[PDB]
Amino acid sequence: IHPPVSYNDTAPRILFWAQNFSVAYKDEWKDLTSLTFGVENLNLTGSFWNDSFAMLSLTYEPLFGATVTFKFILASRFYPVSARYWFTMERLEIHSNGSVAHFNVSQVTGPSIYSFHCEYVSSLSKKGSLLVTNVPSLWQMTLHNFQIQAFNVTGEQFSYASDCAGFFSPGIWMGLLTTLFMLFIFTYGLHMILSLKTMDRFDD
Amino acid sequence: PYNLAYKYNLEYSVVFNLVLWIMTGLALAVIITSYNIWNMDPGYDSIIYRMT
Amino acid sequence: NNPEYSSFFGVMGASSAMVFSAMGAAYGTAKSGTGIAAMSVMRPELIMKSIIPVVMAGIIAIYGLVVAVLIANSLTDGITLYRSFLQLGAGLSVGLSGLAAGFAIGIVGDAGVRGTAQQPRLFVGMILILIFAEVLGLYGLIVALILSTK
Amino acid sequence: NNPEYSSFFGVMGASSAMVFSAMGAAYGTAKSGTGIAAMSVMRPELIMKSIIPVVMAGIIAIYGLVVAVLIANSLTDGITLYRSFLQLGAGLSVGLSGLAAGFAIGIVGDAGVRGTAQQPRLFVGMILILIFAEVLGLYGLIVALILSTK
Amino acid sequence: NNPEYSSFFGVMGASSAMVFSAMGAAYGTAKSGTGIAAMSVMRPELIMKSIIPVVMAGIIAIYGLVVAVLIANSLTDGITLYRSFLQLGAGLSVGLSGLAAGFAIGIVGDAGVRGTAQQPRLFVGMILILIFAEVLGLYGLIVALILSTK
Amino acid sequence: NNPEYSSFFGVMGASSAMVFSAMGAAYGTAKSGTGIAAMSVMRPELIMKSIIPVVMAGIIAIYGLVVAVLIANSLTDGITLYRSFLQLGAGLSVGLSGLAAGFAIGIVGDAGVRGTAQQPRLFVGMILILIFAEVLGLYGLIVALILSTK
Amino acid sequence: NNPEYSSFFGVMGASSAMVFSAMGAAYGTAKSGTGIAAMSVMRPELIMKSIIPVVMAGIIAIYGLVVAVLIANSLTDGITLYRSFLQLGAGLSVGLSGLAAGFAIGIVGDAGVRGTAQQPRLFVGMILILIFAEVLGLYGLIVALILSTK
Amino acid sequence: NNPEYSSFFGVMGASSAMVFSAMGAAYGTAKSGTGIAAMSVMRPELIMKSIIPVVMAGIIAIYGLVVAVLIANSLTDGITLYRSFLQLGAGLSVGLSGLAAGFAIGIVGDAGVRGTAQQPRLFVGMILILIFAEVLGLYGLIVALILSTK
Amino acid sequence: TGLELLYLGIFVAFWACMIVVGICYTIFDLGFRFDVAWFLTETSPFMWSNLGIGLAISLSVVGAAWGIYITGSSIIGGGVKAPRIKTKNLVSIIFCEAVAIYGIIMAIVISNMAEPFSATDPKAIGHRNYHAGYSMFGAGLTVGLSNLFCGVCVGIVGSGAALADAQNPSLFVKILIVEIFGSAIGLFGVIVAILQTSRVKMG
Ligand SMILES: CCCCCCCCCCCCCCCCCC(=O)OC[C@H](COP(=O)([O-])OCC[N+](C)(C)C)OC(=O)CCCCCCCCCCCCCCCCC
Ligand SMILES: CCCCCCCCCCCCCCCCCC(=O)OC[C@H](COP(=O)([O-])OCC[N+](C)(C)C)OC(=O)CCCCCCCCCCCCCCCCC
Ligand SMILES: CCCCCCCCCCCCCCCCCC(=O)OC[C@H](COP(=O)([O-])OCC[N+](C)(C)C)OC(=O)CCCCCCCCCCCCCCCCC
Ligand SMILES: CCCCCCCCCCCCCCCCCC(=O)OC[C@H](COP(=O)([O-])OCC[N+](C)(C)C)OC(=O)CCCCCCCCCCCCCCCCC
Ligand SMILES: CCCCCCCCCCCCCCCCCCCC(=O)O[C@H](COC(=O)CCCCCCCCCCCCCC)COP(=O)(O)OCCN
Ligand SMILES: CCCCCCCCCCCCCCCCCCCC(=O)O[C@H](COC(=O)CCCCCCCCCCCCCC)COP(=O)(O)OCCN
Ligand SMILES: CCCCCCCCCCCCCCCCCCCC(=O)O[C@H](COC(=O)CCCCCCCCCCCCCC)COP(=O)(O)OCCN
Ligand SMILES: CCCCCCCCCCCCCCCCCCCC(=O)O[C@H](COC(=O)CCCCCCCCCCCCCC)COP(=O)(O)OCCN
Ligand SMILES: CCCCCCCCCCCCCCCCCCCC(=O)O[C@H](COC(=O)CCCCCCCCCCCCCC)COP(=O)(O)OCCN
Ligand SMILES: *[C@@H]1O[C@H](CO)[C@@H](O[C@@H]2O[C@H](CO)[C@@H](O)[C@H](O)[C@H]2NC(C)=O)[C@H](O)[C@H]1NC(C)=O
Ligand SMILES: *[C@@H]1O[C@H](CO)[C@@H](O[C@@H]2O[C@H](CO)[C@@H](O)[C@H](O)[C@H]2NC(C)=O)[C@H](O)[C@H]1NC(C)=O
Ligand SMILES: *[C@@H]1O[C@H](CO)[C@@H](O[C@@H]2O[C@H](CO)[C@@H](O)[C@H](O)[C@H]2NC(C)=O)[C@H](O)[C@H]1NC(C)=O
Ligand SMILES: CC(C)CCC[C@@H](C)[C@H]1CC[C@H]2[C@@H]3CC=C4C[C@@H](O)CC[C@]4(C)[C@H]3CC[C@]12C
Ligand SMILES: CC(C)CCC[C@@H](C)[C@H]1CC[C@H]2[C@@H]3CC=C4C[C@@H](O)CC[C@]4(C)[C@H]3CC[C@]12C
Ligand SMILES: CC(C)CCC[C@@H](C)[C@H]1CC[C@H]2[C@@H]3CC=C4C[C@@H](O)CC[C@]4(C)[C@H]3CC[C@]12C
């Protein structure tokens, strides 16, 4: 198990782990897990850690004939409807030659005291598509078993890990409510039909 | 090590709901059938009043 | 763009429009039928006159079918969530309205067939009630036509 | 994109089409059967003429089988969730309309076969009502096709 | 590479294919049983001839078993989710069609075996009805096979 | 590696294979017992013969036990999720088929034991019906084995 | 620095305090009501004397109202989750204690007014029992206050 | 700003205030009317007086309406979660208090109307009890107002 | 009571599951997973609005049919010996049907407030659209259930009045008042629904 990428400002602040980390340019794919987790010379320069804003910049020197830099930008703030600080990975920013490609990250959120884990935090539709864009982009990304904690990181250990994998999803919830209403209607209809009784006698 | 999270499958919602509702429906069907057989009319009403 | 599940709800609407309406009609066609079987032993000549409730129950089913078809012909692959839930609302409207109207028609016809057997003057009276019950289902259909074409 | 679980609904369509219709037909074959057994003790000659309700329940089962096979012969591996939802809707419509029609045929056919032992003139009446019940299942079948062959 | 849970639905199919059908068969073999006993007190000579409904119910179980074995042989460690859903649907169809057919066979067989003591001419009639019920299970089996071997 | 919770399902298979079977058997025995009591008040000589249903119920329990023990011997800490599902399906199939066969044997044994007190000729018939019920459990066992050994 | 949904529970206190108590009171005022009517036909002079149960039931409602108003005056936008839980607990305590007291008062009052029509001496006894039932509601109020004024 | 979903609880508050109060008023009117109609054949001159309970039941509906109107006028798309919860609590309080008061009024009015048909002196007594039930609804209104205005 | 037993079992099992699930979520510090906000927000406003319209029409029709058959059975039973009932007591049926009419009207008044968004992000959908969906659902519930109860009540009162009419002609004219009262509830519901969707605007 390769160790997590641990940015340090007097102590571990941003921990980033991924069973796989692959990136593609013009449909040309490449694996970065070996070049990312466990490498002691990782070009983490450009990272930053506010008290309430984190930027993890992983840079690779010869990638795709240029120095590429993936910046994961998260921010945690106090949400009034609770007393909890909730951190969300706001976006991803791929810097290539004098150029920037932005990816929105959809469902990477959770209490700032808990890391966030999600299988296939990827830009592919087949793999969740949490990295999404409306401007067509030449970049694609796949982080398999992506677990990140930017705030409240104590020591080398990820805190408990909220994850996108839930019991229900908006589509499942809508379908279940529709089916529940229609099951109520069908149960009413079937109860009234089953109450049908036939006469046991006929007039002389 | 590193307290890595449990590798939940991204489709957890789908399989959880599929299994939960399929098995709930199957259990309800089995219960209803077993009640319709257990509470079946004994069929010897022609013999209830002869034995009793 | 739109979620891949957006077409579910509309489809269910269509099916609901067919299912519940049919159930309604079925109940009517059952109850009235029972009543006719009870009436016809003493007053056979009234069988044809007393078949009106069943027909009205059938009409209810037709309404559902209409809406179902109207929704089953409008389901496109990229059906948006707005149209999907409009069709779901139309389906629920027509289906539950037809169910209730079929129950009312069945009960009223089962009573009125026997009543007309006893008192001929009740025949028209029975009809004057049945149509009311029937249009309840119609009202649902109307709203469906308002919804699925909003 | 074409999730791994897209086929499930389509499958639950075919099963439904075969299951619920069968249930309906079973009811139509069960209830009516009892009536015939009750009637045939005194009027043996009408036993064969009075099997029509059973035949109509069997026709409901045949509608169910038709839609179930028509769905099972269209379940490709990468079936889109839209097409699988269409197949589920078709299966539910046919199956539950056939279930309601089976209930109606059971009640009507049993009452009619028992009454016809008393008043033969009711026979035709019964048949008409049975037809009005049978069409209900047919309606479902229609909608099912309109959904499944879409 | 396939999901590890994919086999689950598969086995359920098989299990269901052998459970519900069995349940149906049980009901048959139960209800007819009682009827036969109630008939034997007066008309003993009709015992063997009246074992037919039980046999019919037994055949329903066979259907289930057959499909179950089919599914129980089509299960593999890497069974795709699509094939697993197909097997679950085949199991549901066969099991529940056999359940409905067994209930219908039980009711019809009890009624007809009780009647045949009074009116012998009913025997043949009963047989026809039983066939009309039995075919229901057959339909399920057919669909099951179409889904299972697809 | 395999999930730590896999064995759970397999274990339940085993337990189900013994639980539901037992329940089935219980029911069978129970009802048969009651019948024998009502039969013994007038025909004590048939006390030992009328125990046949109880035996045919007890055998069902044995089926369950077999499968349970079989599953209990195929369990391992690193049992693949697929094998655990296979064993759960086998357990459910045997247990619930045995439950259905226990219902059928209980009802048939009660009715036939009461009847044979009055019509000795029914005894053979009763046996046949009991067999036609017992095989149901056997069917489950077969499927269970096919699932368990696989 | 408190959740904005904290007030929810507190509100569900107030609401509950006025709802459940009312329900309880209603039951009292219902059952006793009927009793008075039933006993008013033969013994009209006891109508006013036999109105004590209703009055007691009415008092139960007042209890709830008091607590409800108290809670409704202790609510604030920044109410801490702790105070909100206290108010929910007080509301549930008073409401359900009043519900139980209303059930007891209704049953006891109906029985007592019916008996006093036949046994005058029972009147005082009834009153005593009613007081005991009333005390139950009072207890709730006490606890509610202790919870609602911390 | 406030949450997007905040208005949900206020909407449900208005809906509850109207729905449950309407349920209570409808039950009170139905029960009282079916008592009054049945009495009138015996005591035709009492109907008008006996209409008093119905009016009381109607008043319950008004209470709901009143509170509903408040919640429907103070409810904007951007109300704080606190005010939305307050409106939900007011609506639930008025609605369920009106439901309980309507049940009590229906029971008491029916019983007292029949008793007055049998015992005129009961009339005044009935009124008292009805007031004691009617006040319950009033209590809810009070609390609802206190919650909705806060 | 077999079906009643099934319903009671389902209800008890569901609510025991809910109690245990809430206890587990609260106690295991997993409350943040029980986002009611996420449920109310991700769920499309179109679902709420269309369920509201469908209920507004369907529950009103259900109440109208319930009352119609409740009072028509009595009308046609009484009229066997006093056929005059069929002529005079149709008013009861009329009242029941009136309920359904309100339904469709409110459905229209609700269906006119619908409009697509072209947005999926809750910040994009916005308070206006979410409140429009919730208020359309609430107005549908109010009108549908008020009409259901009003129709059932009017049907019960009409059956009573028809049974009373069969024995004394001069009673219906004085019992119709009850029906009028029973009808008012329907109107009340409609009014409230109109007040709930007065300031509703999707888009
Ligand atoms: C006329 C009406 C008759 C009566 C009513 C019966 C209707 C039953 C219809 C089928 C069930 C539908 C349930 C809700 C799901 C609707 C689909 C949907 O929106 O899903 C899209 C969603 C979209 O997902 P998503 O993208 O929103 O999820 C977020 C992303 N992931 C998934 C990666 C986390 O996908 C699914 O298909 C979800 C799975 C839902 C499956 C629910 C289980 C249903 C079980 C069937 C019933 C039991 C059968 C056995 C019975 C035994 C014999 C009696
Ligand atoms: C019988 C009639 C037919 C059935 C009709 C009723 C159907 C009821 C519908 C059930 C759905 C319930 C929602 C499931 C999701 C919530 C589960 C939960 O709280 O735990 C997960 C929550 C949240 O889990 P989490 O968020 O840590 O997990 C990570 C997230 N996932 C799993 C999605 C990747 O808490 C736990 O982790 C608790 C673990 C222990 C499980 C406790 C479950 C509670 C119930 C157990 C006993 C059963 C109750 C009934 C008793 C017997 C019958 C009366
Ligand atoms: C009389 C009824 C019999 C009692 C039992 C009823 C059935 C309940 C069992 C349901 C199956 C669930 C079994 C556990 C499954 C694994 C869950 C898991 O991973 O847990 C993680 C959960 C949640 O994750 P966590 O809390 O461990 O992780 C840390 C999370 N943070 C950092 C946020 C705190 O916690 C556990 O470890 C739970 C272990 C024990 C769970 C036992 C089941 C809960 C329900 C028990 C019954 C409740 C009522 C008790 C009183 C009854 C009296 C009548
Ligand atoms: C049967 C009739 C209905 C009543 C019983 C069932 C009610 C609930 C049914 C719906 C499903 C469960 C809802 C609760 C979901 C959990 C919400 C959550 O985790 O957040 C909690 C919230 C927030 O949790 P949190 O972890 O965010 O904590 C707050 C932390 N800060 C402030 C920093 C954000 O707080 C609560 O504890 C609120 C109380 C409700 C949760 C408990 C539900 C109670 C269930 C019934 C059993 C009661 C126990 C006593 C038994 C005897 C009763 C007389
Ligand atoms: C076989 C037949 C066909 C299939 C069956 C269809 C019919 C039955 C289905 C009806 C629904 C039953 C299940 C209800 C579950 C209640 C909530 C479960 C608790 C839970 O864990 O939910 C969390 C969210 O819940 C929430 O956000 C809480 C929302 C609760 C709303 C419940 C409303 C409906 C049910 C009760 C009311 C019924 C009346 C109708 C309104 C999930 O958390 P996660 O980890 O997935 O979250 C991910 C992001 N945080
Ligand atoms: C008399 C005693 C006998 C008892 C009676 C019989 C009862 C026996 C049990 C039957 C019911 C449940 C059977 C198994 C359910 C699980 C099926 C999926 C298997 C599973 O765990 O899948 C994982 C994914 O699951 C997921 O992602 C979701 C899994 C969650 C499923 C929860 C189902 C709810 C409960 C259903 C039954 C309720 C009522 C039953 C009557 C693995 O897959 P992976 O690829 O993730 O591998 C791991 C790497 N990540
Ligand atoms: C492949 C096939 C599908 C696989 C999945 C299914 C797995 C198995 C689970 C389904 C149930 C199997 C066991 C059969 C139950 C037999 C039902 C007999 C019904 C019966 O006669 O009992 C009535 C009471 O009903 C009752 O008491 C109802 C039965 C009891 C409920 C059973 C469930 C227990 C609860 C489960 C808890 C665990 C849930 C998970 C958290 C009494 O009839 P009467 O009222 O006239 O009585 C008057 C005389 N006494
Ligand atoms: C109590 C112990 C703990 C139980 C916990 C487990 C959950 C509950 C399961 C049931 C447990 C009790 C046993 C009841 C068996 C079913 C009901 C009785 C038998 C039955 O269904 O047959 C007839 C209905 O026909 C039918 O077979 C139709 C029923 C099937 C309809 C399925 C549609 C509903 C789906 C659920 C969603 C709706 C939710 C609504 C709240 C009703 O018999 P009878 O009363 O006429 O004759 C009197 C004797 N049977
Ligand atoms: C003794 C019996 C038990 C009595 C106790 C009451 C039981 C009520 C059952 C409901 C559940 C309990 C209520 C408290 C838990 C609410 C969920 C809190 C979880 C949480 O943190 O979610 C927030 C959103 O939820 C919220 O803020 C949701 C607020 C609304 C909660 C209450 C709604 C319950 C449903 C009421 C329906 C009434 C229907 C009437 C006909 C976060 O949100 P964030 O802003 O931090 O998001 C940050 C995203 N980046
Ligand atoms: C991470 O996944 C990559 C692919 O995204 C794996 O490498 C690929 O392996 C497949 C299968 O052998 C080949 O077809 C590809 O050409 C490989 N690389 C690329 C860039 O496409 C890689 O083994 C995985 N690494 C882990 C899990 O550490
Ligand atoms: C370590 O990473 C930094 C940050 O990327 C590299 O310095 C420059 O970073 C900017 C901002 O992303 C890029 O636009 C430049 O191209 C980077 N310069 C070069 C020369 O690549 C820095 O070079 C990295 N250091 C090492 C030793 O690899
Ligand atoms: C930040 O400090 C951490 C903790 O020491 C370093 O990461 C650990 O390094 C040790 C060896 O010193 C390994 O055994 C652990 O597996 C590592 N854990 C993690 C979570 O990474 C890390 O190298 C330091 N980072 C920098 C940029 O200096
Ligand atoms: C035993 C008998 C009575 C059963 C009913 C008759 C059978 C032989 C016939 C009648 C109509 C037929 C169906 C008609 C149309 C199609 C659509 C086609 O794409 C697949 C086959 C399918 C679905 C047929 C299957 C067989 C079928 C069901
Ligand atoms: C039923 C009649 C034939 C008696 C046979 C015994 C029954 C109970 C069967 C059921 C399951 C069987 C066991 C299943 C598995 C094993 C493990 C194997 O390595 C040795 C044999 C052994 C231990 C079997 C012995 C026989 C067994 C116990
Ligand atoms: C009740 C008694 C008389 C039944 C005995 C019949 C015999 C011949 C039957 C009953 C069950 C059958 C078994 C069922 C399943 C399996 C598992 C499979 O992987 C190999 C064959 C095997 C092991 C079968 C062999 C034959 C078998 C043992």
Curated annotation (Swiss-Prot), chain A:
Disulphide bridges: none
Keywords per UniProt: Cytoplasmic vesicle, Endoplasmic reticulum, Glycoprotein, Hydrogen ion transport, Ion transport, Membrane, Signal, Synapse, Transmembrane, Transmembrane helix, Transport
GO cellular component, one term: endoplasmic reticulum membrane
Subcellular location: Endoplasmic reticulum membrane; Endoplasmic reticulum-Golgi intermediate compartment membrane; Cytoplasmic vesicle, Secretory vesicle, Synaptic vesicle membrane; Cytoplasmic vesicle, Clathrin-coated vesicle membrane
Membrane-spanning intervals of the chain: 166-186
Record topology, Cytoplasmic segments: 187-204
GO molecular function, one term: ATPase activator activity
Residues listed as glycosylation sites in the UniProt record: N8, N20, N43, N50, N97, N104, N152
Tissue expression summary: Expressed in brain (at protein level).
GO BP terms in the entry: cellular response to increased oxygen levels; endosome to plasma membrane protein transport; intracellular iron ion homeostasis; osteoclast development; regulation of cellular pH; synaptic vesicle lumen acidification
Key word Cytoplasm present: no
PTM: N-glycosylated.
Coiled-coil features, chain-numbered ranges: none
Subunit structure: Accessory component of the multisubunit proton-transporting vacuolar (V)-ATPase protein pump. Interacts (via N-terminus) with ATP6AP2 (via N-terminus). Interacts with RNASEK. Interacts with TMEM106B (via C-terminus).
Family: Belongs to the vacuolar ATPase subunit S1 family.
Role description: Accessory subunit of the proton-transporting vacuolar (V)-ATPase protein pump, which is required for luminal acidification of secretory vesicles. Guides the V-type ATPase into specialized subcellular compartments, such as neuroendocrine regulated secretory vesicles or the ruffled border of the osteoclast, thereby regulating its activity. Involved in membrane trafficking and Ca(2+)-dependent membrane fusion. May play a role in the assembly of the V-type ATPase complex.
Listed name of the protein: V-type proton ATPase subunit S1
Organism: Rattus norvegicus (Rat)
Lineage of origin: Eukaryota, Metazoa, Chordata, Craniata, Vertebrata
Originating gene: Atp6ap1
From Swiss-Prot, chain B:
Cytoplasmic-side segments: 33-52
Coiled coil segments of this chain: none
Domain of life: Eukaryota
Transmembrane region(s): 12-32
Name of protein: Renin receptor cytoplasmic fragment
Native organism: Rattus norvegicus (Rat)
From Swiss-Prot, chains C, D, E, F, G, H:
A GO CC term assigned to this protein in UniProt: synaptic vesicle membrane
Membrane side Cytoplasmic: residue ranges: 29-50, 110-126
Location(s) in or outside the cell: Cytoplasmic vesicle, Clathrin-coated vesicle membrane; Cytoplasmic vesicle, Secretory vesicle, Synaptic vesicle membrane
Keywords: Cytoplasmic vesicle, Hydrogen ion transport, Ion transport, Membrane, Synapse, Transmembrane, Transmembrane helix, Transport, Ubl conjugation
Site (Essential for proton translocation): E134
Membrane-spanning residues: 6-28, 51-71, 88-109, 127-147
Membrane topology: Multi-pass membrane protein
Biological process according to GO: negative regulation of autophagic cell death; positive regulation of ERK1 and ERK2 cascade; positive regulation of Wnt signaling pathway; synaptic vesicle lumen acidification
Disulfide bonds: none
GO molecular function, one term: ubiquitin protein ligase binding
Tissues/organs with expression: Expressed in brain (at protein level).
First-listed, main subcellular location of the protein, grouped into a coarse class: membrane
Residues exposed to the Lumenal side: 72-87, 148-150
Pfam families the UniProt entry points to: ATP-synt_C
InterPro entries registered for this protein in UniProt: ATPase_proteolipid_c-like_dom, ATPase_proteolipid_csu, ATPase_proteolipid_su_C_euk, F/V-ATP_Csub_sf
PTMs per UniProt: Ubiquitinated by RNF182, leading to its degradation via the ubiquitin-proteasome pathway.
Gene3D superfamilies: lithium bound rotor ring of v- atpase
Its job: Proton-conducting pore forming subunit of the V0 complex of vacuolar(H+)-ATPase (V-ATPase), a multisubunit enzyme composed of a peripheral complex (V1) that hydrolyzes ATP and a membrane integral complex (V0) that translocates protons. V-ATPase is responsible for acidifying and maintaining the pH of intracellular compartments and in some cell types, is targeted to the plasma membrane, where it is responsible for acidifying the extracellular environment.
Record-stated family: Belongs to the V-ATPase proteolipid subunit family.
Protein name: V-type proton ATPase 16 kDa proteolipid subunit c
Source organism: Rattus norvegicus
